[PDB]
RNA sequence: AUAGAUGAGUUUGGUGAUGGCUCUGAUUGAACACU
RNA sequence: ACGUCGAUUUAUCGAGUAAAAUUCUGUAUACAUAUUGAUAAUGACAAUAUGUACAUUUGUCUUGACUAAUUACGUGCCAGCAGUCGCGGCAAUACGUAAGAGACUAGUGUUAAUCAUCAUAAAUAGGUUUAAAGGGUACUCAGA
């Protein structure tokens, strides 16, 4: 698997903010409070789309995609 | 046990377990040839009931074992050269061996249609 | 909408307070099924003890146990008893547990270990169901002493609730506990 | 072990987690108990420490 | 100032003791203990250089939620700085005078950091608090007084002037109590510090250990504003209150408090003493004949130069910022090292321990200073030789951001009267409720309503006397 | 996922060959991976050989198939980037759950995490 | 010897298991070494040596112990301040490794593996919250301190 | 090179952020491990000889 | 070499333990039976 | 072949896109040619490359649970099955037939053996009140 990383974030931040607090990051209010307040809290500093999971389980038969006869079919 | 007790040799191998077919397990052979000494019948123990066809065989090594005759109906008698393989009749004491039915003198069940490989039955060759 | 024509979910519809259609979206699975027997003055009385796990697949798992002379009623009891006992289970990156946990339930010790992503649920047949229902995807397990089906599930459920909270360990020691994988990639790589 | 597991000191920690997310994935968490915010800033005292 | 710029700016200069200050870190608590009981925990360059790097470091961590500063012994919290040492350096040529200016530079850099700190700061005033000790507390939002507290600024008696920013805290005190405490260098003990307004809370010294263990249990959320954090600590301090004494009455209150406002409202010491002479004169209606007489005996025993300079900044300090104060005080205290009164008063009272008679100021008395004289004009002109004080940060403010945790003063009572229709007795109750029955609110509010409250329309309403 | 349009393949080829721009610049300009930019040129060079050798191309099969797949025309109308060009390979060492105990006020950077 | 560290590991557990505020340990050069490591790691509150009775808790840090001569060395003792947070002790487990019957020595190449949750030798990987103390030339450090200083030594105990 | 690096890390200064964030341990307890002989041993022995008599 | 650690059937009126046996995985310089 | 076969609800459920048929390829192999194994020269024998040509078998185990996969009839603790628990005493999903189903395949099963399972001789890493297992006792040389 791979991980997308944009250069804009790296240039500004060096990952220190990710360790703020007790090592995991600055905590945010619960969801049932953000809907109550009128103004939305400031967005967290991190890479774009850095909370969606990756489908590792669906790469079981990836080795078969390396065969020459399969690659001709996928093309 | 303390490290000292282990230094003096406290860890010994576990007591051996008896094999299902000692005559074959002892010499690492899959099967042996023997001369049928007696073809009789053995009765199962408490739960089971019936007449199990067995055969007293004298192996080539010299051991005299009791083998079980699988299938329905056999054609062996006194002085029959039969092939012995491992196995055991779970309800017959002393019957710790089986006899191959496609063996030298023991014939296979001719009226067998399922699991012919287990009873040494050639295919009927109906169309052929 | 006719989903519950028997009325078994009505009593549960008040405790947890959610539609019956939402109760059918929960992952349920019968784990244990014992045939117990009580000797009475009127002869043996055989019952069916069952343990069912309920989870939505996003960090909630409930364990329920019940018994009855009928196998059908015993499963519906535990199912309702497991959906109302749901509790949030902390999961690291929504894929594994925090660190390692070792629990003991009357001679049945269970040792769960956190594993890197892409490792899979290389666990036994009962833990696979609990992890697959709670939302975990990478884990390792090992039964040290005994393999009793029931205590095996009780110990594993108590282990998913006895995980070391990395923040409580930090405030107690006065020292940060940095998530190296978070700083390295700039966020929680799920 | 004639005693019982009393978790009276963690009613907030437990209630705060059960109210953070919703059991029905895909919906916002419902409002928490009316007492969750009252004792938000009044933690319990340390007990059982000789 | 990062962790590296601080360590290089506060190097452990040769001579600094290893255990001058004793730091500690609990769950959420960070303590600071001035460990020098032999000298009443007197501040010095060695101690200041150990506290500034820590405070800067704890400011970058979100796990440290409450800071506490306290003393070591059971007698003093911080009994002034090493003023006796600066006198010797001042007598070693210009090279030695700059060392004194450097010391005041470090001290002002620390007090400013404490005034603009981004975390709750508490001060256990369990002992005598003078000089440098008054700098570590007055700017903090919480100042816990006890039975052992002895507040004072014995700075005009040694020829010196007020201190690290009392010139910013005193002007905006209720009425003219600020200049009074400075010029006369009064001595407030125990609960009188709580009533005067210097201290925000008053607990018994035996309940301070239990208070710390509680401040550590508090674990605020990262998304809480500083206002929420200070409110949670304010309600936690009020839980350990055993109640103010039942017999001790407000010292500066009623008659004495009115006299302070009638004799310290002028801009010239000649008029102030002239007004006091009227009070001391038998037959006056003020009723402070004994007090006025005692105050005069103390005003004619201090350096007349400091009085002029002191009163001068009390009128100017009402418009300066917290940061502008330190910068001006540095350029101001830099010229006091060159003066004759300071080097004389310190030597004649601390090094000589009163030997060779009392101090002998360059001007014998205020009478010598002619009316046209304006000696309080050179100490307010920064020279180019002394570089401008470089503070650790740019934070500043004209009024304290969070300084309303103490007892209600005239400003609060006024705001209530001007925004309501409360009566004499119904107004006192309004404060006992909002303050959650804080000890001493009924006695403090009643006093304010006994000096600046007139029963114009009867029991229906109450108005102020100024009109 | 969209595939490089026929006319788009030429834009990448002409930029690297005619204008002689570095592959990295072309990869970052159109948000195309350097591994794909190099393949587009290799495959395009084989076309020049076929056209030079007077070989018949599979034009009937190319036009019909390209109508079944999503395309991304580069140049002016660049709605979205073709793909992610900064994807990093997940090293086995960086997959471990590590909680290093450090000072409460430490500036843990990516460099420090790599050493952990 | 190592027998003292083993007794110290068991006692600190029994004291935390009993939820005691203070704990006493025999005043030895070896015990003070590990105690400073636990304090530097954040498990115990403070360390001050005193007589058979604990110092005044109000002035624990300010406590000024008397000199340790042959006239009182037989009565001295190390008083440790235990920690409890969130209804749970901070020093729950202190499982030892190097016992009197066998001293386990680890290399830098092995500690680097144990520091990331991978077994090496007679040790096991460290998980979240766990901690391993090693006695080396530079004092009784932590496996992550010894890995930074690039040294091995004698493994003392594992703390959870 | 591997010897200098291995020797440079074993004699490196403690991290500043880890020096400013550590509780103070009095030197009287963390460094006074030497146990000298009682200076008054000769006096106590003489006095103890009288009392025992 | 950093992905590598997994269980199942079976004693009891029944539950929980203890302790074997057997199956599940890989293999052979293998033999036999049916092909 | 708008046929056939097995079930049955004559239209349901299947054999079944299966077959036949049509359109292509020329795989193992056959043959030819060339190079090469080798060079100073020597080729027993064959490999490699290219050209042309051909569409060539099914077999076997299992089907109560462990263990993926069902009914019918016959048999009646008989005959037999079984790696373990077990099945069979006249309406047997476990035996023997028939059909269907599950799976491996020029292999498929069985027997024998080895490792792992087994922390089941535990150095890593066990245990001994009531379950295998504390010596009748502790002074003591060696030894830890
Ligand atoms: K004090
Ligand atoms: Mg049997
Ligand atoms: Mg069949
Ligand atoms: Mg069969
Ligand atoms: Mg019984
Ligand atoms: Mg067992
Ligand atoms: Mg060919
Ligand atoms: Mg030759
Ligand atoms: Mg099945
Ligand atoms: Mg049985
Ligand atoms: Mg059958
Ligand atoms: Mg083959
Ligand atoms: Mg005995
Ligand atoms: Mg004997
Ligand atoms: Mg005996």
* Tokens 């123990």, residue located: B45
Task: List the helix and strand counts (H, then E) for chain B.
Answer: 3, 5
3-state secondary structure of H6: helix
Residue C25 to residue D23, Cβ atoms within 8 A? no
Q: Which residues of H touch F106 (CB under 8 A)?
A: 15, 17-18
Chain breaks in chain F (C to N over 2.5 A) after: none
3-state secondary structure of F63: helix
Distance between CA atoms of E183 and E276, rounded to whole angstroms?
A: 13
Which neighbouring-strand residues pair with E419? none
> Do residues E114 and E165 lie in contact, with contact meaning Cβ atoms separated by under 8 Å?
no
| F103 burial via Cβ count (<10 Å: 0-12, 13-18, 19+) | buried
Q: Does A42 touch chain E (CB under 8 A)?
A: no
- In what helix (H) or strand (E) does residue G131 lie, and over which residues does it extend? strand G131-136
> Do residues B51 and B41 lie in contact, with contact meaning Cβ atoms separated by under 8 Å?
yes
Measure the CA angle with vertex C85, ends C17 and D43; round to 5°: 90
Q: Which residues of A touch F111 (CB under 8 A)?
A: 14
* Tokens 């012994």, residue located: E73
> Do residues E310 and E99 lie in contact, with contact meaning Cβ atoms separated by under 8 Å?
no
Per-residue tokens: E333? 């205290």
Question: What is the dihedral sign for C-alpha C78, C79, C83, C87?
Answer: positive
- In what helix (H) or strand (E) does residue E152 lie, and over which residues does it extend? strand E150-152
* Tokens 């975990």, residue located: C136
Per-residue tokens: C94? 């929504």
Distance between CA atoms of H31 and G139, rounded to whole angstroms?
A: 13
Measure the CA angle with vertex H17, ends E390 and E67; round to 5°: 70
Per-residue tokens: E100? 């004194």
> Do residues E453 and E424 lie in contact, with contact meaning Cβ atoms separated by under 8 Å?
yes
> Do residues C177 and A25 lie in contact, with contact meaning Cβ atoms separated by under 8 Å?
no
Residues 23-52 of B with CB under 7 A from strand J: 24-25, 28-31, 44, 47-52
| E178 burial via Cβ count (<10 Å: 0-12, 13-18, 19+) | buried
Distance between CA atoms of E127 and E187, rounded to whole angstroms?
A: 13
Query: What's the Rg (C-alpha) of chain E?
Result: 22
Residues in chain A: 75
In this structure, what DSSP letter does residue D36 have? T
Q: How far apart are the first and last CA of chain G?
A: 23
To the nearest whole Å, the CA of H36 is away from the closest chain E CA by 23
State the distance from the centre of ligand 11 to the C-alpha of C35, rounded, in angstroms: 29
Q: Is the CB of B86 under 7 A from strand J?
A: yes
Per-residue tokens: E276? 């006091």
| C-beta neighbour count of C88 within 10 angstroms | 19
> Which of G58, G62, G85 is nearest residue E27 as measured by Cβ atoms?
G85
In this structure, what DSSP letter does residue A37 have? S
CA–C1' span, A16 to J120, in Å? 53
Question: What is the dihedral sign for C-alpha E289, E291, E293, E296?
Answer: negative
> Do residues E138 and E114 lie in contact, with contact meaning Cβ atoms separated by under 8 Å?
no
Cα distances from B35 to residues B25, B41, B98, E280, in angstroms, run 20, 17, 14, 144
Q: How far is CA E442 from the centre of its chain?
A: 25
Q: Which residues of G touch B3 (CB under 8 A)?
A: 101-102
Taking alpha carbons only, the member of E8, E100, E112, E19 closest to residue E53 is E8
> Which of G46, G57, G61 is nearest residue E33 as measured by Cβ atoms?
G61
Distance between CA atoms of C94 and C52, rounded to whole angstroms?
A: 23
Residue F84 backbone dihedrals phi, psi, to 5 degrees: -85, 125
Q: How far apart are the first and last CA of chain F?
A: 37
3-state secondary structure of C128: helix
Query: What's the Rg (C-alpha) of chain H?
Result: 23
Distance between CA atoms of C122 and C134, rounded to whole angstroms?
A: 16
Which neighbouring-strand residues pair with G136? G139
* Tokens 């007197």, residue located: E42
> Do residues F99 and C166 lie in contact, with contact meaning Cβ atoms separated by under 8 Å?
yes
Distance between CA atoms of H21 and E359, rounded to whole angstroms?
A: 46
Question: What is the dihedral sign for C-alpha F106, F107, F108, F111?
Answer: negative
3-state secondary structure of G110: helix
Taking alpha carbons only, the member of E399, E405, E409 closest to residue E115 is E399
Query: What's the Rg (C-alpha) of chain G?
Result: 16
Q: Does F105 touch chain E (CB under 8 A)?
A: yes
Contacts of F31 (CB under 8 A, 6+ apart): F81, F82, F83, F84, F85
**Are 3 or more Cβ–Cβ pairs between A and G shorter than 8 Å?**
no
Q: Which E-chain residues 23-82 have CB contacts (< 8 A) with chain H?
A: 23-25, 53-54, 57-58, 61
Residue D44 backbone dihedrals phi, psi, to 5 degrees: -70, 165
Strand pairing category for C27-40 and B81-85: unpaired
How would you list the strands of the sheet with E187-189, edge to edge?
Answer: E76-79, E128-130, E150-152, E187-189
Which neighbouring-strand residues pair with E123? E69
> Do residues C78 and C29 lie in contact, with contact meaning Cβ atoms separated by under 8 Å?
no
Contacts of C48 (CB under 8 A, 6+ apart): C33, C34, C35, C36, C67, C68, C69, C70, C71, C74
Is residue B36 left, alpha or beta, with left meaning phi > 0 and alpha meaning psi from -120 to 50? beta
Residue B96 backbone dihedrals phi, psi, to 5 degrees: -115, 25
Q: Which nucleotides of J are covered by protein (CB under 7 A)?
A: 59-63, 77-89, 96-98, 108-113, 119-127, 143-144
Q: Which of E20, E107, E126, E163 is catalytic?
A: E163
Structure's resolution in angstroms: 3.0
- If you write DSSP's letter for every residue of E359-390 in order, what string do you get? ---SSS-TTTS-TT---TTSTTS--SSSPPP-
CA count, 13 A, side-chain hemisphere, B77: 1
- In what helix (H) or strand (E) does residue H48 lie, and over which residues does it extend? helix H41-52
Per-residue tokens: B44? 């199962």
Distance between CA atoms of E230 and D41, rounded to whole angstroms?
A: 11
Measure the CA angle with vertex E365, ends E363 and E367; round to 5°: 110
> Do residues D10 and D39 lie in contact, with contact meaning Cβ atoms separated by under 8 Å?
no
Distance between CA atoms of H53 and H51, rounded to whole angstroms?
A: 5
Taking alpha carbons only, the member of E395, E463, E386, E461 closest to residue E423 is E461
Q: Among the residues of E220-349, which ranges form H helices?
A: 226-237, 255-263, 269-280, 289-299, 304-316, 322-336, 340-346
> Do residues C89 and C60 lie in contact, with contact meaning Cβ atoms separated by under 8 Å?
yes
Q: How was this structure determined?
A: cryo-EM
3-state secondary structure of B61: coil
- If you write DSSP's letter for every residue of A52-67 in order, what string do you get? ----GGGGTTGGGGGS
Residue B118 backbone dihedrals phi, psi, to 5 degrees: -75, -20
Contacts of B86 (CB under 8 A, 6+ apart): B20, B21, B24, B25, B30, B31, B97, B98
């Amino acid at each position: 698997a791979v991980v997308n990383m944009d250069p804009a974030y790296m240039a500004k931040y060096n990952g220190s903010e990710q360790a703020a607090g007790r090592g995991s990051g600055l905590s945010e209010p619960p969801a049932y409070e953000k809907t109550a307040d009128e103004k939305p809290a400031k967005q967290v500093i991190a890479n774009p789309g850095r909370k969606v999971p990756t489908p590792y389980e669906q790469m079981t038969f990836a080795p078969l995609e390396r065969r020459l006869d399969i690659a001709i079919f996928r093309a | 046990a303390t490290l000292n007790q282990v230094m003096r040799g406290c860890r010994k191998p576990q007591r051996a377990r008896h094999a299902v077919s000692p005559a074959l397990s002892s010499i690492k052979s899959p099967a042996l040839k023997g001369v049928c000494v007696k073809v009789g019948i053995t009765r199962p123990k408490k739960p089971n009931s019936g007449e199990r066809k067995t055969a007293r065989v004298r192996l080539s090594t010299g051991k005299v074992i009791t083998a079980y005759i699988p299938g329905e109906g056999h054609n062996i008698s006194q002085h029959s050269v039969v092939l012995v393989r491992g196995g055991r009749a779970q309800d017959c004491p002393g019957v710790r061996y089986h006899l191959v039915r496609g063996a030298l003198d023991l014939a296979g069940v001719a009226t067998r249609m399922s699991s012919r490989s287990k009873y040494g039955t050639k295919k009927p060759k109906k169309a052929s | 909408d006719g989903l519950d024509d028997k009325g078994q979910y009505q009593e549960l519809k008040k405790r947890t307070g959610m539609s019956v259609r939402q109760i059918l979206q929960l992952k349920t699975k019968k784990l244990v099924h014992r045939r117990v027997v009580n000797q009475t003055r009127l002869g043996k009385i055989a019952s069916d003890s069952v343990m069912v796990i309920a989870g939505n697949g996003d960090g909630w798992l409930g364990l329920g146990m019940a018994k009855s002379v009928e196998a059908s009623i015993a499963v519906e009891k535990a199912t309702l008893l497991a959906i109302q006992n749901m509790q949030p289970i902390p999961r690291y990156e929504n894929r594994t547990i925090y660190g390692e946990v070792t629990t003991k339930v009357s001679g049945t010790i269970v040792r769960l270990n956190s594993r890197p992503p892409g490792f899979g649920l290389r666990v036994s047949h009962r833990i696979f169901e609990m992890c697959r229902a709670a939302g975990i995807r990478d884990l390792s397990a090992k039964f040290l002493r005994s393999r009793n089906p029931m205590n095996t599930v009780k110990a594993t459920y108590q282990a998913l609730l006895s995980q070391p909270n990395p923040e409580d360990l930090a405030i107690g020691r006065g020292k940060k506990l940095v998530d190296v994988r978070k700083v390295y990639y700039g966020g929680s790589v799920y | 072990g004639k005693g019982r597991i009393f978790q009276a000191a963690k009613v907030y920690q437990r209630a705060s987690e059960a109210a953070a997310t919703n059991i029905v994935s895909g919906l916002p968490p419902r409002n928490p108990p009316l007492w969750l915010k009252a004792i938000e800033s009044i933690p319990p005292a340390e007990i059982n420490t000789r | 100032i990062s962790t590296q710029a601080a360590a290089e700016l506060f190097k452990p200069v040769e001579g600094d003791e290893p255990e001058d200050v004793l730091f500690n870190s609990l769950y959420n608590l960070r303590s600071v203990e001035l460990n020098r009981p032999a000298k009443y925990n007197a501040l010095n360059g060695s101690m200041i250089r150990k506290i500034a790097p820590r405070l800067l470091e704890w400011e970058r961590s979100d796990m440290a939620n409450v800071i506490v500063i306290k003393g070591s012994g059971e007698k003093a919290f911080c009994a002034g700085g090493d003023v006796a040492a600066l006198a010797k350096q001042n007598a070693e040529g210009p090279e030695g005078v700059k060392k004194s200016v450097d010391y005041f530079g470090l001290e002002y850099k620390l007090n400013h950091l404490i005034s603009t700190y981004t975390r709750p700061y508490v001060a256990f005033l369990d002992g005598i608090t003078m000089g440098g000790g008054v700098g570590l507390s007055i700017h903090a939002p919480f100042r816990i007084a006890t039975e052992r507290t002895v507040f004072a600024m014995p700075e005009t008696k040694i020829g010196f002037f007020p201190d690290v920013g009392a010139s910013f805290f005193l002007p905006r005190m209720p009425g003219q109590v600020g200049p009074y405490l400075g010029l006369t260098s009064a001595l407030l003990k125990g609960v009188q510090v709580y009533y005067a307004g210097i201290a925000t809370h008053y607990l018994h010294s035996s309940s301070l250990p239990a208070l710390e263990s509680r401040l550590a249990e508090l674990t605020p959320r990262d998304y809480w504003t500083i206002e929420q954090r200070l409110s949670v600590i304010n309600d936690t301090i009020e839980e350990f209150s055993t109640g103010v004494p039942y017999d001790e009455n407000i010292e500066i209150g009623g008659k004495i408090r009115l006299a302070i406002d009638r004799c310290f409202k002028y801009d010239k010491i000649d008029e102030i003493i002239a007004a006091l002479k009227e009070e001391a004169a038998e037959g006056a209606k003020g009723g402070v004949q004994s007090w006025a007489k005692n105050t005069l005996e103390e005003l004619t025993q201090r350096s007349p130069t400091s009085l002029h300079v002191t009163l001068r900044q009390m009128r100017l300090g009402k418009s300066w910022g917290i940061a502008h104060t330190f910068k001006r005080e540095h350029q101001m205290a830099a010229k006091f090292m060159k003066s004759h009164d300071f080097n004389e008063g310190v030597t004649a009272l601390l090094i000589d321990k009163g030997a060779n008679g009392p101090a002998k100021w360059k001007p014998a008395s205020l009478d010598e200073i002619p009316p046209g004289a304006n000696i309080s004009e050179d100490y307010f002109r920064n020279d180019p030789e002394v570089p401008v004080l470089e503070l650790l940060n740019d934070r500043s403010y004209m009024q304290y951001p969070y300084n309303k945790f103490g007892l209600p003063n005239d400003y609060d009572v006024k705001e209530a009267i001007e925004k309501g229709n409360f009566t004499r007795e119904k107004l006192i109750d309004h404060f006992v409720e909002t303050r959650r029955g804080k000890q001493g609110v009924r006695e403090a509010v009643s006093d304010v309503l006994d000096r600046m409250a007139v029963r114009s329309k009867g029991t229906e309403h109450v108005q102020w006397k100024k009109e | 996922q969209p595939v490089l349009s026929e006319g788009s393949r030429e834009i990448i080829y002409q930029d690297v060959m005619e204008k002689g721009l570095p592959i990295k610049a072309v990869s970052a300009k159109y948000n195309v991976d350097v591994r794909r930019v190099a393949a587009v040129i290799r495959l395009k060079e084989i076309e020049k050989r076929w056209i030079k050798e007077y070989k018949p191309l599979a034009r009937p099969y190319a036009r019909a198939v390209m109508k079944m797949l999503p395309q991304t025309v580069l140049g002016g109308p660049d709605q979205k980037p073709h793909e992610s060009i900064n994807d990093v390979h997940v090293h086995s060492y960086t997959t471990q759950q590590l909680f290093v105990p450090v000072s409460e006020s430490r500036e843990f950077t990516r460099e420090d995490a790599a050493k952990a | 010897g190592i027998q003292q560290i083993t007794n110290m590991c068991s006692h600190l557990q029994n004291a935390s298991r009993a939820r005691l505020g203070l704990t006493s340990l025999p005043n030895t050069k070896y015990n003070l070494a590990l105690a400073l490591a636990l304090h530097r790691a954040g498990f115990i509150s403070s360390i001050t040596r005193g007589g058979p009775h604990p110092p005044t808790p109000e002035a624990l840090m300010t406590y000024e112990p008397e000199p340790v001569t042959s006239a009182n060395v037989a009565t001295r003792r190390l008083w440790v301040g235990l920690k409890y947070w969130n209804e749970e002790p901070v020093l729950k487990e202190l499982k030892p490794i190097s016992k009197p019957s066998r001293l386990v020595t680890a290399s830098l190449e092995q500690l680097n593996r144990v520091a990331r949750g991978f077994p090496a030798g007679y040790m096991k990987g460290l998980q979240l919250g766990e901690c391993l103390f090693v006695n080396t030339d530079r004092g009784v450090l932590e496996v992550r301190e010894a890995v930074e200083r690039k040294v091995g030594g004698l493994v003392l105990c594992k703390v959870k | 090179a591997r010897y200098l690096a291995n020797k440079r890390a074993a004699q490196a200064p403690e991290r500043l952020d880890e020096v400013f964030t550590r509780a103070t341990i009095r030197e009287s307890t963390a460094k006074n491990t030497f146990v000298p002989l009682d200076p008054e041993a000769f006096v106590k022995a003489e006095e103890a000889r009288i009392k025992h008599a």
